Each structure stands twice: as structure tokens, then as C-alpha cells.
Amino acid sequence: EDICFIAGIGDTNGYGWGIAKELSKRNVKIIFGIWPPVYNIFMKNYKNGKFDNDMIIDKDKKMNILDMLPFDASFDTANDIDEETKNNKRYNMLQNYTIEDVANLIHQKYGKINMLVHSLANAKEVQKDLLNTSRKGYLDALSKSSYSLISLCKYFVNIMKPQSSIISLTYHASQKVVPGYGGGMSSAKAALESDTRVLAYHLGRNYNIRINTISAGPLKSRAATAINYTFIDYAIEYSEKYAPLRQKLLSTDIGSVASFLLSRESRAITGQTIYVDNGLNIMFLPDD
Amino acid sequence: EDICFIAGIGDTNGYGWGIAKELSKRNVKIIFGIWPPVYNIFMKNYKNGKFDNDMIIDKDKKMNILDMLPFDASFDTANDIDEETKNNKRYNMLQNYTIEDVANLIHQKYGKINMLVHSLANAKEVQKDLLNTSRKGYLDALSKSSYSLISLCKYFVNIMKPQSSIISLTYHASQKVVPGYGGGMSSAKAALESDTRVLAYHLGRNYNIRINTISAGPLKSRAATAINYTFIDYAIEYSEKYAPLRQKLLSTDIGSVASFLLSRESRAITGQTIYVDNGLNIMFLPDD
Amino acid sequence: EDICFIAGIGDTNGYGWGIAKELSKRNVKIIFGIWPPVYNIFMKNYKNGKFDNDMIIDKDKKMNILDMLPFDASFDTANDIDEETKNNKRYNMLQNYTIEDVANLIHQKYGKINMLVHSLANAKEVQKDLLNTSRKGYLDALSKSSYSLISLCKYFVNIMKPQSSIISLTYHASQKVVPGYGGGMSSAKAALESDTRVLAYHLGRNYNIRINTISAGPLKSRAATAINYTFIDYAIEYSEKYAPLRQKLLSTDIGSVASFLLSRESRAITGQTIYVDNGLNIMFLPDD
Amino acid sequence: EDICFIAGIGDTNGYGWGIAKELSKRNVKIIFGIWPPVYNIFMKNYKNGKFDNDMIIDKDKKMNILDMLPFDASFDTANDIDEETKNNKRYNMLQNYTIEDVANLIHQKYGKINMLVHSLANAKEVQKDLLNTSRKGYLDALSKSSYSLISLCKYFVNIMKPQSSIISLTYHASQKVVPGYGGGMSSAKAALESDTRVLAYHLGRNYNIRINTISAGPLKSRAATAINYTFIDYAIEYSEKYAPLRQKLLSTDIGSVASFLLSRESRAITGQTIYVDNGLNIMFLPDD
């Protein structure tokens, strides 16, 4: 009897969605954590069947969405959330959306979960290059994109079965330089990729939980479109031109590998950056 | 209905067998390629029921062994087999056992296959360390345990459908040094992990076929015992003491990962070393 | 005519000192940036000849200390420094010790410098393990240990000659897990190691400056003693027991490599993590 | 007063020569080991002044060539040289040219040496890609360009002082794929980079000798021209266009790094691949 929390959703054009579709294939209950600023739009959009098409699985199954909670990766507990976001139009008429508040809500309603997905990123200044990034700007990126992963584990470790599994999405910009991947994201993902290891050790030895990370090719998600003729269009162009696998990478191409990593079928794998990127990661020089 | 060729089983105590079992679970049909030295024993042993306990699958399955063929990875085509090997006690009574000849035999009997497993390694002077390995010994190591992959691939690709997948097995002693892993075994493993990428580019672009490699943790196999209470018993103790996951590492743990990679679930992963080893590889210092 | 700024000093038992001794060997003017809280103790200690012994270079040379400035890697400009540290006993009777204020002071007095050393770390919670680290705690570590490097480059790029060179000290805890290396340091060093690359590209293409990083073995510095029978005593124990180079790693063992990296003799090397650690980094399993 | 043996010079257009020059600058004495095919030409050419322009060092130095010996890296001892090679036009008139024989010759003439350079690579089927490389071709690649290092080391160690150092040259196509780098050259390079560690452990612990390897950028050498406006001209264009450092890569750039590693300045570095390549290796995506 299986439950998965997915932290990081605001639409259906991302990897979290990809991941939720493939998990559904093996009958796993999905709990979405939506960033509060878009929680209400996402919810109204759901009710109104915008995703009814996107919720279909090959074999005549609905995606089994157990619940849909506001979730904000920038605050660990209730006592971390500041006054300005306390007023905030959007945040104001929701509650219990810190990391710890949602680890509780979920636990409260459905018991122990046993799969966890970190699928979120923010870098206020992704626009700028690493050199022109401000401290405040850089640290937000690390807080929201890297630390949040640790913070999830701490709070969710307590509501997880043993032999549970955690994942997290990463990008190659942390190993090799991609110009334009600014704001400290590259920085942020390096730490993620390393924290993944150290967590794998603490989580592995103490609770017998596994944690891994998926290094993803480029997908024209709502968030990648925000980066920028958008660098995501160029990343996909190059990738489909040059990657050893000449096909088009789909969000479920990631979903399947994730479903695998969240399953027992992978009990011997932990602390791994796993590359799901049509093989681009292995190339040095272009063919032309 | 998929068919897979596993190159290099001698007994039910290896990773090959582990991979055989887990594939069977997913209902894929098994062609075993066996080293002539041990062909007749394996065959005799199999007939006498000795493997019957070992062919038990959890959900009351047997094992779909489609065939058991003599096979030797040193010989590419028939004009390679030297007059001595040709005439040897073991080799004289057997036929069609070069890489090309079994690629043909299998094709005639069962048509194009879609999965290919490389689970053999060999090295004359394995007991001698790198410095004291002869040229003859080292090139032999590489020939048997590295090149056989490139050759398996040259010949087998033409009897494989597109979207098919190929995996091999490696050891972490290619990346960081474990002394006692001699005779150029480290060298061959490092070659095989590089070969794995170059081939992922050629096979990827030209056949839309994927190739990957599992860097496995330590197992008490027949051939791991051969290294000179032995180095493998020490390895298994270290792993079970110092690895993030303190569970005993089972060949079916590798088995199920190999299964995953050979399936369509892994359609966007290629050219990668995947570690299946309880996460030992992430450790720098023993905590104790 | 050569000048080097070294950001991160409070005594003579660290790597910055090691680095300053070896640079002196090739007649490079040294400018120390001391953390304000210990600036005055360090200065009084200097005047009183505590370091007169440590200032000797093999070949009858004094270390040429051009100047000694208070320097605080946690504030980028004057407008970043808060009220509490504005009162602060220690900080209060010093001025111009932000990153930008010192890039100016130096420039003002001696012109363009042409070698830059980042040799500093802070992680408030190094005591704890990654899991038990707080957000505030983690982000301090990244701010002080990782971001500061970027911040140096931005401000110092402007007072550097072209063909200048920058370095930074790192630790293997970012690639492989060392238990006990907590507080987000591991995290911090990963980002450093990656920022080093991305900076190498921006700095390389724009100003023709090189930037590299030195991955150091363990040294019983004043700061390592603070970590903890102190994990630094254990790190050295293991290292001297097991590293391929059986000798004792000295702070100048690092100093020489740094002097090399800061010289023109290395004009083709950039964005590199360079391991100066008696070779420990390359080992998997112990000998026993 | 140090002596170094450079294995593999054919002309003044390679990295060997570059390494020869930079060493000379540091006043170390040069023993050249030359491949018999080109021995007589090199020698004749040298006598006729043709290299005199090329032997200019900046600070009005010449070059301290202590000796120029015939040398062939395929033959370990004299009982290896087959009757055919023994009798060949080029090989018949020359003597003491196996790895052991020159290790002896040099010892008799000049006593124990302290520096050792490995700047040779060779591969029969370099023009064919990995998939289409024969077993014969590949093992030949490995024999010549990989094993010769392990053998140079077995024999030369006993005519080397402790604290001595050994370097070899590699290409980045061992890590990420550059197609056109065939015949198993990628494979040999990957072996050599693994060999480099295993040997750093054996030589480190048993002789207190260091071994490292320079992964060089592209140079218009004689042997780089041989690969089939050629692949190397494309390589040089890519490097000079897309690398962080847009300066033209010169063999003396490698030269001076090799010098550094062979000196005591690098006493704490061993088993490493050091990249000397204008930082190209850090790039994932071309910015343009």
C-alpha cells in the first residue's frame, strides 16, 4: 500500500508531473505539494478539468491524486515564516504549508508515507551570471533549491516507513559549466548532488532509507521558459542535435527512472547522481 | 516477449545467474552463453536437477531458459580459433562458439533479440599486482575482460532490434585503487567504463541501441574466490560494515537493476556507469 | 613586480601561512587579510615577534609582509554590515574591512595586485551532522565559505592585472562523504569546487584571469582543532597510515603547489580542483 | 643536478620537446629515448643544425641534451624482440633499445636518475572507430600506449632515487567521448589514467616515488596530424574558440607543468590526472 509526496508543482509541464504519471502506473498514491503563490490557481485549474487529459495513464487508469496541499520549501517551521508573507495576498488565506506542517498534515491523514520526491528550484537571479550574483541572491538559491532537500528529509524521515526511498532532480551545470545557468543554481545543484551523498550515509545508516538524484536533460517546462531566444530552446536544440540518443526526451522518460529509484527494485542504490539525459553528459566534442 | 543473451555463466553463484532470475520474473526468455572449459559440467549439473532449487522464483515461477550454448569471448570469428584450442579436449566436441558464430546460431534459432548481458571478466596474472604484470598477462586481461564487449557489440547489434539495450559488469577499482585487484583487472575495468561511453555514442546514433554498465558491490562468486581467507571475504566484510546500507548485497539486487536497464524504463539512460553496491562508493573515510 | 592578497588568517598554523612562505621564496609581496575579531591579537602578536621564527625562509629571506588589514568575508560592502557587529567590542575600532573596502585600500596604497588567495572557512554548526543542520546555520556556511570566493573575484577583478591568477582551498568531503565534516561544510566546498569552474569561464573569457582550487590533506591547524579525540587527529592518523605517500603533509606542501598555480608557469590550467593530499584521494579500500 | 629520460621524441614539434625545453630551463639534464623507425633521421637532422633554432631557450640557454638513445616501448627485455624486428633494416644496426636495456644503459653511463617522462602513444587502427577496431588492433593500442608505462616503471624504478617523479601524457577522450579518437586510443588513455593511480600506490608505498599524468589540450604534432583538414585542426579551432582561456596552446605550456610535477614543488601530488588544456574540459555547452 503505497504513498508518495511530491514537493514542487505549479503546473503539469514539469518533471514532478512526469514523475507522478509513471508512479501511477504501479499504483502509488500521489500527494502534491504546491508552492502557495500558485496553489489556488492550480486548484481552480484542477477542479475545472484542465489536467483531466494529462491525468490519463496508458492503461485505463486515472492518476490517483490522494491530496493537494500548499507547501513552501523556504520555511522549515511555523516560526520561520515572516510578516510580509504573513500579509501576502496569496499566502494569507492558507495555513500549515511549512515543511514541518505538511509532514504533519500528511502523516495525520494517511499515516506513514514511503516515497519522497524533491522536484523544485528557485534562484531569484538565475537571470544574471555567477559573477554578478548578489549574496542575498545566491543564498536564496541555496536555501530554496538545496537546503530544502535536507530539510524535507529531517521532517519526513519521521513519517516514513523503513526501506523508504527519496529522490531529487539535478542538472549537469554543477559538474560542467553551462553559461547562462546563473543565479547560483549551478552552485545550488552541486550542493544538492553532494548533500545527496552525505544524506545517503546518515539516512542509510540510521533509518535504512535510500536517497538518490536524477540528472535530467532539458525539458521545455514552465520554469525553464522563465530562464532565458530562451536558453532552454537552445539546450533542447543542442541536446536533440548531439545527444547519443537522437530522440526527444519526455518528462516521463524521467518519470520511469524515478519510479524505479523509488521502488524496492533498486534497494542496492544510494547516494547516486543518475544521469537521465539521452546520454548527452558523456560527450566532449560536437560532431560538427 | 523479449529475448536476452547472458554471456558468462558458470554456475548459479554469480551475478549472471542473479540477472537471469530477475529477468525471468519480468518474463523475458533466457539464452545462456557458457565458457567451454565448464560447459559440460554446467550441462550435466543442470540435467541432474542440481540447479532446481536455485531456479525457484518467488511468485511460483521457474526460469525460462530458452537455450544453453557453448561460448568463448576470446574468439571473434572462426578463423580466430587457433589449431590448439580447436583440438583441445574441451573445445573439440563443441561448435559455433565464437562471438560471430553464436550471434548467428541465436539468430537462426530465435530471430533478432533485444537484450544483451556481458557478465565475464578474466585475467591471467590477477594475483600479481599492476607493476608486476607482464605485457602478455595485461593484454590478455584486456582482451578477455574488455574487448569482448566491443566485439559482442559489433556482431550482436545486427541481430538486435532498435531500442534494444546492452549492459556489462564493472568494479569500482577502476576509479579508486583497491590493491589485490591485479593482473590489469583494474585497467580492463577502466577500459570497459570508457568503452561503455564511446559505444553508447556509436550504437546510440547508428542503431538507436543503449549500452550501460553496472559497477557492482562484492559477491562470493566462483571467480571472486579465485583472487589471491581471500580478498573477497575481506571485501564483503568491509562493505557490510562500512557501507551506507548495511544489508547483505545479493546478486538479485544487481539482477533487478540489470533488468531495469535492459527494459524500456531506462530508455533515456546510456553510456553510464551505474553503481549497485549499497552506496559504498560515496565513502571517503570509514566512520570507525 | 609581484603582490598577493591572502584572505583568511588568524595565526601561523594554517595553510594561508604555508602559502605565504612559499610565495616569498619567489619574491612575492604578501598582504594578509585578518578576520577582524582576531586582527588586534594577531597584530600585537606580530609586533611582539611571535612569528619572527615562522617568518624565516630557507634561503636567508624574511617573509615580505607588505601590509596587514582587517578583512571580513561575510560583508560585501559597507552597506551590508549590521548594527550588532557595528557595536561589537572587536569590530568597532576598525574600519574598511568589507570585501570592497579592502579591494580599495590595497589598490589605493600599492596599485594593481596580480595574485589572489581565498583561504578561509566558517560553518557555525560544523559540530552537527548535515541532517541536524539548521537553515540559518547551513546558509552562513555557504555565505562565509563559498560565496565569499565569488565576492572576492568581483571586487578584486578590478584591481588585478591581466594574466593574474586566483586560488582557493577545498576538501574531499564534497566529493566523498566524511562523517563529522558537518555544518554544511561539505555542501559549502562542493559549491566552491563548482563555482571555481564557472568563475574560471567568466574570468577566463572576460579578463583573461585564471582561477583554481587546491584539495588539501588534513593539517592540524588552529581551525581543524576546533572541529572535533578531535576528528582532525583521526584524519591525519588515517592519512599518514594509508595515503600512498607515507610522509607527513606540511602546510608548505600546499604552499608550493599554490605558488605554482599563482605563477605564469601554469598559464594553461584553470577551473581545476587540484589534489594536494599525499595521494589519499585515489584510494578505495584500506590495506588492513 | 637532476637527470631526466624522455621516452618518445621524434621531432621538435611535440610535447616531448616542449617538456625537454622547460626542463632545460630548470637546468635538468636530458636523456632522449627515440623510436628506431625515426632514430637515424632525428640524429642526422640534429647534426645538421636543423634543431638549433628550436633549441633556443629564452634566457640565452641552449639545451642540455645529455644523450639521444634508440628506444622502443613494445619490448620489455631482449628476449622479447622477435627475430623479424631483430633483423629489420632500421632495427639491425642498433642495440640496447628495449625498456630494460636502456634502463641499464642509462644507469651505467650516468647512475641513478630522478625524473621520467612518458610521451608516447600508438594505435594500429586509430582511424577506425571503437566498434570497428579489431582485437589485434585494440590490444596493440593498449600494449604500446598504456602498458609501456607500467613497464617503463617496473624497470626504471631501480635506477631512480627516492623522491623521484614520473609523468605521462593523456587525452580527455578517456572521460567524455570525442569521436575520431579511435583504434582503442580512448581505451588506452582511460587505462593509463587508472594505471596512473594503482602505480602511484605501489611506487608511493614501496619506493617513495610519485607518478602523475597530464591530460593535454590539442597540439599540431606529427602524430596528431596522422589521425584521419584532419581532426586535430578542428580540435585546435574548437579549443581556441570555446575554451575559457583563448590563448593558443603551446607545448611549453605543457612543458612547464611537466617540469613542475617532476620537481619537488609537487611532492604531495600523486596518482592525479592534471589537465593542461586552457580549461576546455570544464565546459558542457558551447556558449555560441
Ligand SMILES: NC(=O)c1ccc[n+]([C@@H]2O[C@H](COP(=O)([O-])OP(=O)(O)OC[C@H]3O[C@@H](n4cnc5c(N)ncnc54)[C@H](O)[C@@H]3O)[C@@H](O)[C@H]2O)c1
Ligand atoms: N526541465 C528542465 O529543463 C530541467 C532539466 C534538469 C533538471 N531540472 C530540475 O527539475 C526540477 C523541476 O523543475 P521543472 O523543470 O519541472 O520546472 P517547474 O516549474 O515544474 O518546477 C519548479 C516548481 O517548483 C516550485 N517552487 C519554487 N519555489 C518553491 C518553494 N519554495 N516551495 C514549493 N515550491 C516551489 C515552482 O512553483 C514550480 O512549481 C528542478 O529542480 C529543476 O532544477 C529541470
Ligand SMILES: NC(=O)c1ccc[n+]([C@@H]2O[C@H](COP(=O)([O-])OP(=O)(O)OC[C@H]3O[C@@H](n4cnc5c(N)ncnc54)[C@H](O)[C@@H]3O)[C@@H](O)[C@H]2O)c1
Ligand atoms: N563477484 C564479485 O564480487 C564482483 C564484484 C564487482 C564486479 N564484478 C564483475 O561482475 C562480472 C561477473 O562476476 P562474477 O563474480 O559473477 O563472475 P563469475 O564467477 O560468474 O565468472 C565469470 C564467468 O565468465 C566465464 N568466462 C570467463 N572467460 C570467458 C570467456 N573468454 N568466454 C566466455 N565466458 C567466460 C567464466 O567461466 C565464469 O563463469 C565480472 O565482470 C566481474 O568483474 C564481480
Ligand SMILES: NC(=O)c1ccc[n+]([C@@H]2O[C@H](COP(=O)([O-])OP(=O)(O)OC[C@H]3O[C@@H](n4cnc5c(N)ncnc54)[C@H](O)[C@@H]3O)[C@@H](O)[C@H]2O)c1
Ligand atoms: N587543515 C586542514 O585540515 C584542511 C584540509 C583541507 C582544506 N582546508 C581548507 O583550508 C582553508 C584554510 O583553513 P586552515 O586549515 O588554514 O585553518 P585556519 O584557522 O587558518 O583558517 C580559517 C581562517 O579563516 C578565518 N575566517 C573565518 N571567517 C572569516 C571571515 N568571515 N572573514 C575573514 N576571515 C575569516 C579564521 O579566523 C581563520 O583565520 C579552509 O578553507 C579550509 O576549508 C583545511
Ligand SMILES: NC(=O)c1ccc[n+]([C@@H]2O[C@H](COP(=O)([O-])OP(=O)(O)OC[C@H]3O[C@@H](n4cnc5c(N)ncnc54)[C@H](O)[C@@H]3O)[C@@H](O)[C@H]2O)c1
Ligand atoms: N598532440 C596532441 O594534440 C595531444 C593532445 C593530448 C594528448 N596528447 C598525448 O601526448 C603524448 C605525446 O603526443 P605528441 O603529439 O607529442 O606525439 P608525437 O608527435 O611526439 O609522437 C609520439 C612519439 O612517440 C614515438 N613512439 C611511438 N611508438 C613508440 C614506441 N613503441 N617506442 C618508443 N617511441 C615510440 C613516435 O615516434 C613519436 O615521436 C601522447 O601520449 C598523446 O596521447 C597529445
Ligand SMILES: O=C(Nc1ccc(Oc2ccc(Cl)cc2O)c(Cl)c1)N1CCOCC1
Ligand atoms: O527559479 C527560477 N528559475 C528556474 C530556473 C531553472 C530551473 O530548472 C531548470 C530548468 C532548465 C534546466 Cl536545463 C535546468 C534546470 O535546473 C527552475 Cl526549476 C527554475 N525562477 C523563479 C524566479 O525568477 C524567474 C525564474
Ligand SMILES: O=C(Nc1ccc(Oc2ccc(Cl)cc2O)c(Cl)c1)N1CCOCC1
Ligand atoms: O580472471 C580471473 N579472476 C577473476 C578476478 C575477478 C573477477 O571479477 C571480480 C570479482 C570480485 C570483485 Cl570485488 C571484482 C571483480 O571484477 C573475475 Cl570474474 C575473475 N581468473 C583467472 C585466473 O584464476 C581464475 C579466475
Ligand SMILES: O=C(Nc1ccc(Oc2ccc(Cl)cc2O)c(Cl)c1)N1CCOCC1
Ligand atoms: O568554521 C569553523 N570550523 C571550521 C571547520 C573546518 C575548517 O577547515 C577544515 C579543517 C580540516 C579539514 Cl580535514 C578540512 C577543512 O576544510 C575550518 Cl577552516 C573551520 N568553526 C568556527 C565556528 O565554530 C567553531 C569552528
Ligand SMILES: O=C(Nc1ccc(Oc2ccc(Cl)cc2O)c(Cl)c1)N1CCOCC1
Ligand atoms: O598511433 C598513431 N596515432 C596517434 C594518435 C594520437 C596520438 O596522440 C594524440 C594526438 C592528438 C590528440 Cl588531441 C590526442 C592524442 O592522444 C598519437 Cl601520439 C598517435 N599512429 C599510428 C598510425 O599512424 C601513425 C600515428
